[PDB]
Amino acid sequence: ESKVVVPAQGKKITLQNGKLNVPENPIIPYIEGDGIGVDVTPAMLKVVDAAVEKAYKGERKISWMEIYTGEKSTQVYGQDVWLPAETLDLIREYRVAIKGPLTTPVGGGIRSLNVALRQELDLYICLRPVRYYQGTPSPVKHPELTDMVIFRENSEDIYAGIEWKADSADAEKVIKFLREEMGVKKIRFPEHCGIGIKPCSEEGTKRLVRAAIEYAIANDRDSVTLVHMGNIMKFTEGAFKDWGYQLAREEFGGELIDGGPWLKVKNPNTGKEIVIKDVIADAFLQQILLRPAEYDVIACMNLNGDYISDALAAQVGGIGIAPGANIGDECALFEATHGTAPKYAGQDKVNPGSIILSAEMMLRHMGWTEAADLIVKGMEGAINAKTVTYDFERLMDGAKLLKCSEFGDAIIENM
Amino acid sequence: ESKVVVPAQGKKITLQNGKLNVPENPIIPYIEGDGIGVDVTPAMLKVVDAAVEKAYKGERKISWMEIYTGEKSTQVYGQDVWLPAETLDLIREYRVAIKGPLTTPVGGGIRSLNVALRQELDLYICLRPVRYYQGTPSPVKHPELTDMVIFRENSEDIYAGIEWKADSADAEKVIKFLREEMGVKKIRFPEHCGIGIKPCSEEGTKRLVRAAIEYAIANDRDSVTLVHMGNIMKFTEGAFKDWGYQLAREEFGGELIDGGPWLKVKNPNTGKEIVIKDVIADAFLQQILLRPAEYDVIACMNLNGDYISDALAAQVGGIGIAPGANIGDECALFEATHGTAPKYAGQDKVNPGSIILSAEMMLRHMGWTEAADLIVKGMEGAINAKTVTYDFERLMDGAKLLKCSEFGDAIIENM
Ligand SMILES: O=C(O)CCC(=O)C(=O)O
Ligand SMILES: O=C(O)CCC(=O)C(=O)O
Ligand SMILES: [Mn+2]
Ligand SMILES: [Mn+2]
């Protein structure tokens, strides 16, 4: 029997015509998260409640409902229950949810729980905005020049988990087929060879890129850059870029800039000419360091998005405070983007900034922009005040060391 | 008939027992390179000749022999001759060669010429050392903490070019096979879907990792880090890491550090305990910025190596002066690692640092360490003297702007 308790006071968010109908008392499912989730989640709940209370003068209030996934799920439902069917059902049913870091066990043949949540709920958009918060200790000279929003495709690519182990009967079978029936000759060593499949479809590419362009329009952003490795992988990465440009032309009236290949899409609200361009992935990893100001909205495939998001987070000193969201047509799951750091679990020491900023994204997604704005304001003030957790403090001089919970309070105090 | 002229004075380098027998007058094949290759190659030839002349007091002298690949090949041999069979033969025959940047044409269905050279000559090691040269304008605060050597697997991975176009009969065939015979269910959108294959074998992984560990030993390096995405791709990237550790144990007496998974390999010459460790690729892209001093020799797959090498080059301000080598058991091809920048071709303006430093690697590979040391010394002095090309100069104050050829002279002057 389920151990999830539906809040007595609270109402389910609904979806109508692609628009969320959020009540003043929405029930929001939340997954504590493994390791440090025990530290960061309480801080997030308190910070969000304060922002909501302050923004709407007590008129609105979230009814938090704990659901399970990960190590805590096994402890609540038993041995092999890492991801309960009800969790997938509840997230879909309640439309909006948030979670702390999750870890996948090894030895049992189970694949990434984070990816499982994304694929099973068809949350095809991994949204990762990366900006700099003044006062944050950064390894680069000008982190303030970084203000990007990453639209990472979440349902395809090698990240889809389609592969076979070297020497397995399946691997031999696939390799045999490829060589004998497909005439593949580029497999350097066919024996003791692992094989993975990388899929990329037109519908997959277009729904991701459509969301990216719509975001640029809605937020009056300057450009959308299709990042890919099409020079090497023409049929997957290359097709992604091709379909991205095609979508811009076919659905957003994209016009040619100069002799190509860049396009300009007129923002139907501001009249701003949004530039649609593309950069080879490896070169892009250099350009984010060398010319960050030239980039804004980024649209890319699963793996590249994972790399780009992490690299960007690192350079702005946001490795531990990078917000993230997994959005689909029916529901959305916001999440802390860092690991579980089990060594510090329960020490009330880690930075709750990531999950808090992800809650900021959640609030904005629900249409509660005032509360979201309050969290952004609190984070900016706390960081600028140099009242921070150990991860920031250790890289700074003249900073006040704060516990995880205390930093949560600092954010509230700066709202 | 061939238009390659074998130098009258000069002798072929030979290979015996895995050791190169280099004469005092070795014939070295060289490919000018497209675009700026017309600028950087002459500078390289002059710099190398000066280093050789100075190091060995006129006793040794390279007999340069021009061979063709790329745009210049089509002009020398005709319309469709992008990569002549003789070029592959000559490089193998002469054992050591160098080349300027190469570009692959689009529209003719031809794949990367750089990859073609690597795969066809089985140059399985892409060696990319990345260090900082004092005085180089860098986007990071402490580029001097970067001193790494990248061992990128060069014959496998998605980089192998095994793929089929969306809607092609072949793609449909493969997808059908995967779904109906392999029972694959993770292909989100089977229609209008491009497909790529990612292979990774035990022999491929081990020969790359073997070279990496041997390099750490020969150069008394502190550690070898296996970089991979095994948490997501268990059978390719994960297997790579597994085989890498296994090789360390089976062939280099690797011992367990603490409770694992790190290993220590005793350097048989210095007694130094070389640490063998591993880091997930996305996290590694963050760690190179946050904790560069903790890394040294890196062993990774093709694609990850491409990303890591470019990211590292960018952070030390070496985007245009990053050396590179493609090494196999029978021959080796050193190369400028940047693009062709056709806009500046012939303007004697671009930085010849990349191809020159690659020539430094070449000289060292031939056992001519004195000459190689002279080039390193010249580069360090020229850069530190602030007498540099536009790409450096534009990011600095109080620097003397030099043409490509002039920077070549500056290097010589600082030898
Ligand atoms: O894949 C996982 O298990 C963790 C989530 C992750 O690192 C990501 O894809 O960014
Ligand atoms: O692949 C090419 O054509 C250029 C060489 C390259 O960028 C590389 O693999 O680093
Ligand atoms: Mn990640
Ligand atoms: Mn490259």
- Per residue, the 3-state secondary structure of A257-277, as one string, reads CCCCCCEEEECCCCCCEEEEE
Q: Could you tell me the two tokens for B335?
A: 């190369």
- CA-nearest residue to B164 within chain A is A235
CA dihedral B297, B303, B304, B306 (to 10 degrees): 60
Sort out which chain B residues have CB atoms less than 8 A from A184's CB and list them.
162, 197
Q: Could you tell me the two tokens for B401?
A: 């702007």
Give the ranges where A66-112 is alpha helix by DSSP (H): 71-77, 85-94
Sort out which chain B residues have CB atoms less than 8 A from A196's CB and list them.
197-200, 233, 235-236
- CA-nearest residue to B178 within chain A is A174
- CA-nearest residue to B165 within chain A is A235
**Minimal CA–CA distance to A4: which of A80, A121, A87?**
A87
Alpha-carbon distance B156 to A195, whole Å?
A: 11
- How many domains does chain A fold into? 1
Q: Is A256 helix (H, G, I), strand (E, B) or coil?
A: strand
Q: Could you tell me the two tokens for A184?
A: 């593949």
**Which atom of ligand 1 is nearest to A309's Cα?**
10
How many CB atoms are closer than 10 A to CB A295? Answer: 24
- CA-nearest residue to A140 within chain B is B140
- CA-based nearest distance B6→chain A, Å: 32
Q: Do the Cβ atoms of A207 and A124 come closer than 8 Å?
A: yes
Alpha-carbon distance A15 to A118, whole Å?
A: 19
DSSP state of A370: H
CA angle A125, A61, A352 (to 5 degrees): 55
Alpha-carbon distance B154 to B367, whole Å?
A: 23
Burial (Cβ within 10 Å: 0-12, 13-18, ≥19) of residue A251: middle
Mutate to test the interface with B, among A111, A115, A197 (most CBs of B within 10 A): A197
Mark yes or no for CB contact B173/A187 under 8 Å.
no
CATH of the domain at B53: 3.40.718.10
Residues in binding site of A for NADP(+): 103, 338-344, 351, 390, 394
Sort out which chain B residues have CB atoms less than 8 A from A154's CB and list them.
none
Q: Which amino acid is at B299?
A: A
Q: Do the Cβ atoms of B129 and A132 come closer than 8 Å?
A: no
Alpha-carbon distance B217 to B223, whole Å?
A: 9
- Is residue A354 lining ligand 1, measured as CB closer than 6 Å? no
Q: Do the Cβ atoms of A342 and A33 come closer than 8 Å?
A: no
Q: Do the Cβ atoms of A275 and A221 come closer than 8 Å?
A: no
Gap from CA of A135 to ligand 3 centroid (Å): 24
Supply φ then ψ for residue A69, to 5 degrees: -165, 140
Supply φ then ψ for residue A162, to 5 degrees: -105, 105
User: Looking at ligand 2, which residue's alpha carbon is closest to its atom 8?
Assistant: B306
DSSP state of A35: T
Distances A373 to A54, A357, A359, A389, A404 between C-alpha atoms, Å:
11, 11, 11, 22, 21
**Minimal CA–CA distance to B177: which of A177, A199, A168, A172?**
A177
Mutate to test the interface with A, among B200, B294, B340, B394 (most CBs of A within 10 A): B200
Q: Could you tell me the two tokens for B380?
A: 């360090």
**Minimal CA–CA distance to A98: which of A328, A309, A305, A326?**
A326
Q: Do the Cβ atoms of A216 and A268 come closer than 8 Å?
A: no
> What's the Rg (C-alpha) of chain A?
22
Which method resolved this structure? X-ray
Mutate to test the interface with B, among A113, A172, A186, A287 (most CBs of B within 10 A): A186
Mark yes or no for CB contact A166/B239 under 8 Å.
yes
Sort out which chain B residues have CB atoms less than 8 A from A202's CB and list them.
166, 189, 191-193
Alpha-carbon distance A167 to B160, whole Å?
A: 20
Q: In sequence order, what DSSP letters do the residues of B24-37 get, joined into one string?
A: SSBEEEEE--STTH
Q: Which amino acid is at A86?
A: E
Supply φ then ψ for residue B66, to 5 degrees: -75, 130
Mark yes or no for CB contact A307/B307 under 8 Å.
yes
Alpha-carbon distance A97 to A370, whole Å?
A: 19
**Minimal CA–CA distance to B201: which of A147, A167, A236?**
A167
Q: Which amino acid is at A137?
A: P
> What's the Rg (C-alpha) of chain B?
22
Supply φ then ψ for residue B196, to 5 degrees: -130, 150
Contacts of B105 (CB under 8 A, 6+ apart): B82
HSE of B72 in the Cβ direction (CA atoms, 13 Å)? 21
Give the ranges where B168-301 is alpha helix by DSSP (H): 169-176, 202-218, 239-252, 281-290
Mark yes or no for CB contact B196/A141 under 8 Å.
no
How many CB atoms are closer than 10 A to CB B107? Answer: 5
Supply φ then ψ for residue A167, to 5 degrees: 75, 0
Ligand nearest to the Cα of B283, by number: 3
Alpha-carbon distance B288 to B308, whole Å?
A: 9
Lining ligand 2 with CB less than 6 A are A 232; B 104, 112, 114-115, 306
HSE of B347 in the Cβ direction (CA atoms, 13 Å)? 13
CB pairs under 8 A between A and B: 239
Of residues B182, B195, B201, nearest to A199 (C-beta):
B195
b/e B141-180 (16+ beta carbons within 10 angstroms → b): eebbbbbbbbbbbbbbbbbbbbbbbbeeeebbebbebbee
Q: Do the Cβ atoms of B325 and B335 come closer than 8 Å?
A: yes
Q: Going by DSSP bridges, is the β-strand pair A163-164/A147-153 parallel, antiparallel, or unpaired?
A: unpaired
Q: Could you tell me the two tokens for B78?
A: 């005709």
Gap from CA of A22 to ligand 1 centroid (Å): 29
Contacts of B281 (CB under 8 A, 6+ apart): A307, B227, B228, B229, B237, B300, B304, B307, B308
Q: Which residue has the tokens 């080039």?
A: B375
Mark yes or no for CB contact B236/A163 under 8 Å.
yes
Q: Treating both helix axes as pointing N-terminal to C-terminal, what angle do A302-315 and A281-290 enclose, rounded to 10 degrees?
A: 20
Q: Do the Cβ atoms of B213 and B125 come closer than 8 Å?
A: no
Q: Do the Cβ atoms of B275 and B296 come closer than 8 Å?
A: no
DSSP state of A296: -
Number of residues that make up chain B: 415
Sort out which chain A residues have CB atoms less than 8 A from B283's CB and list them.
310
| Helix, strand, coil fractions of chain A, as percent rounded to 5 | 40, 20, 40
Distances A325 to A255, A365, B285, B290 between C-alpha atoms, Å:
31, 10, 21, 25
Of residues A115, A140, A199, nearest to B193 (C-beta):
A199
DSSP state of B293: G
- CA-based nearest distance A306→chain B, Å: 7
DSSP state of B197: E
Alpha-carbon distance A232 to B111, whole Å?
A: 7
Contacts of A20 (CB under 8 A, 6+ apart): A13, A14, A95, A96, A365, A366, A367
Q: In sequence order, what DSSP letters do the residues of A116-185 get, joined into one string?
A: HHHHHTT--EEEEEEE--TT---SBS-GGG-EEEEEEE-S-SGGG--EE-TT-HHHHHHHHIIIIIS---
Q: Going by DSSP bridges, is the β-strand pair A332-336/A323-327 parallel, antiparallel, or unpaired?
A: antiparallel
Q: Is A377 helix (H, G, I), strand (E, B) or coil?
A: helix
> Number of helices (H) and strands (E), helices first, in chain B?
13, 18
Q: In sequence order, what DSSP letters do the residues of B50-106 get, joined into one string?
A: HHHHHHTTTS---EEEE---SHHHHHHH-TT-SS-HHHHHHHHHHSEEEE------S
- CA-nearest residue to A162 within chain B is B186
Q: Going by DSSP bridges, is the β-strand pair A323-327/A125-131 parallel, antiparallel, or unpaired?
A: antiparallel
Supply φ then ψ for residue A387, to 5 degrees: -105, 95
Contacts of A24 (CB under 8 A, 6+ apart): A56, A59, A60, A61
Distances A55 to A48, A364, B46, B135 between C-alpha atoms, Å:
10, 13, 70, 51
- CA-based nearest distance A106→chain B, Å: 9
Q: Which range of residues forms the domain containing residue B122?
A: 1-415
Ligand nearest to the Cα of B99, by number: 2
Mark yes or no for CB contact A204/B189 under 8 Å.
yes
User: Looking at ligand 2, which residue's alpha carbon is closest to its atom 5?
Assistant: B114
**Minimal CA–CA distance to B332: which of B122, B177, B181, B138?**
B122
Q: Could you tell me the two tokens for B29?
A: 């094949």
- CA-nearest residue to A289 within chain B is B139
Gap from CA of B120 to ligand 2 centroid (Å): 15
Alpha-carbon distance B231 to A313, whole Å?
A: 20
Q: Which residue has the tokens 């061992």?
A: B151
Mark yes or no for CB contact A197/B178 under 8 Å.
yes
DSSP state of B237: I
Q: In sequence order, what DSSP letters do the residues of A304-359 get, joined into one string?
A: HHHHHHHHHHHHTT-TTT-EEEEE-SS-EEEEE-S---TTTTTSS-S-THHHHHHH
Bridge partners (DSSP) listed for residue B228: B280
* Residues lying with their CB under 5 A of ligand 3, a single-atom ion: B 282
Sort out which chain B residues have CB atoms less than 8 A from A194's CB and list them.
199-201, 235-236, 239
Q: In sequence order, what DSSP letters do the residues of B337-381 get, joined into one string?
A: -S---TTTTTSS-S-THHHHHHHHHHHHHTT-HHHHHHHHHHHHH
Burial (Cβ within 10 Å: 0-12, 13-18, ≥19) of residue B381: middle
Supply φ then ψ for residue A280, to 5 degrees: -65, 135
End-to-end CA distance of chain A, in Å? 41
